[PDB]
Design a binder for this molecule. Structure first.
Ligand SMILES: O=C(O)[C@H]1O[C@@H](O)[C@H](O)[C@@H](O)[C@H]1O
Ligand SMILES: [Cl-]
Ligand SMILES: [Cl-]
Ligand SMILES: [Cl-]
Length: 302
């Protein structure tokens, strides 16, 4: 069959878009040409929230979203969203590739989603019209976040005025001053054109919330076991491809925004980490969540 998958990003070569296209190529190979994936980027099939609901009801086969908008519907996705959980991108990758990530992926089935892969999304940092070097600088800042209660809390802990909005509304919001700031990785800051509106990128690195690729359980459950396995393998094998593309995009977008006049600022990251204890207290509240946070931070470096 020809499966459909959604992505919000406009660029046809954005790493997440390229990665699901690569997954499709692998699936064609593994299935002897039976199965294919068509990737609808440019939010053609809806916002992240909308596509999650379409996958839930089986109208859409796959969606590639960030964990943020999955925080309510698949609560263990909150774990890798948590601020300053991971010590480095290497730590994140090892954690997500191992038993922690695999358990989180499996946990979404209870809500109607087959979790297939985590893709890299770098670290998210504040961008605004002024430098945010300490948490005091963030006080009162009108900053967009994703549609997630955890995210509202995360940024509120900095003293900021968290403003949940869909991704597609952020560019115009920044241009018109409806919002002061937002937060994201550099490729998003670049490719969504947020850098056109605000130039100061303060490296708070306050989350490494990854992307998650999910399939509709309704659709998955009707496929033969052998074909379910092909899909899972193709997704898993696409992660290494996504990461190589992601590394390249990190560099390309950094060059783009520096050339465009962005001011990249180092910050007192401990200032921001020091306010996050209550976020763990208020969100990491179940045995599974506590166990998985601990497993992540018990992970040994290579
Ligand atoms: O902030 C957002 O809404 C966006 O952030 C990006 O990092 C992510 O790649 C998008 O899928 C979307 O979640
Ligand atoms: Cl395609
Ligand atoms: Cl969106
Ligand atoms: Cl944001």
């Amino acid at each position: 069959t020809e499966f459909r998958s959604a992505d919000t990003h406009n660029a046809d070569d954005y790493p997440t878009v390229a990665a699901v296209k690569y997954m499709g190529e692998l699936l064609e190979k593994k299935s002897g040409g039976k199965h294919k994936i068509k990737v609808f980027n440019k939010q053609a099939l809806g916002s992240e929230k909308e596509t999650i609901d379409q996958v839930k009801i089986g109208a859409l086969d796959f969606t590639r979203v960030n964990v943020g908008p999955m925080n309510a519907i698949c609560p263990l996705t909150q774990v890798p969203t948590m601020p300053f959980l991971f010590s480095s991108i290497a730590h994140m990758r090892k954690s997500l590739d191992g038993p922690v990530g695999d358990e989180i992926l499996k946990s979404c089935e209870s809500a109607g989603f087959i979790g297939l892969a985590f893709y890299d999304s770098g670290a998210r940092s504040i961008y605004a019209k002024k430098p945010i070097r300490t948490v005091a600088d963030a006080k009162g800042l009108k900053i967009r976040v994703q549609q997630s209660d955890l995210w509202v809390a995360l940024v509120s802990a900095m003293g900021a005025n968290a403003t949940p909005m869909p991704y597609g509304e952020v560019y115009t919001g920044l241009k018109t001053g409806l919002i002061d700031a937002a937060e994201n990785n550099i490729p998003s800051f670049d490719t969504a054109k947020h850098v056109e509106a605000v130039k100061v990128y303060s490296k708070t690195e306050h989350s490494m919330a990854p992307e998650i690729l999910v399939m509709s359980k309704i659709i998955y459950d009707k496929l033969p076991k052998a074909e379910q396995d092909m899909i899972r393998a193709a997704a898993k094998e696409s992660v290494a491809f996504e990461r190589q593309k992601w590394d390249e995009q990190e560099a390309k977008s950094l060059a783009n925004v520096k050339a465009a006049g962005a001011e990249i600022v180092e910050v007192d990251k401990k200032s921001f980490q020091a306010v996050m204890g209550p976020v763990y207290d208020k969100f990491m509240t179940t045995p599974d969540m506590k166990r998985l946070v601990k497993a992540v931070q018990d992970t040994k470096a290579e």
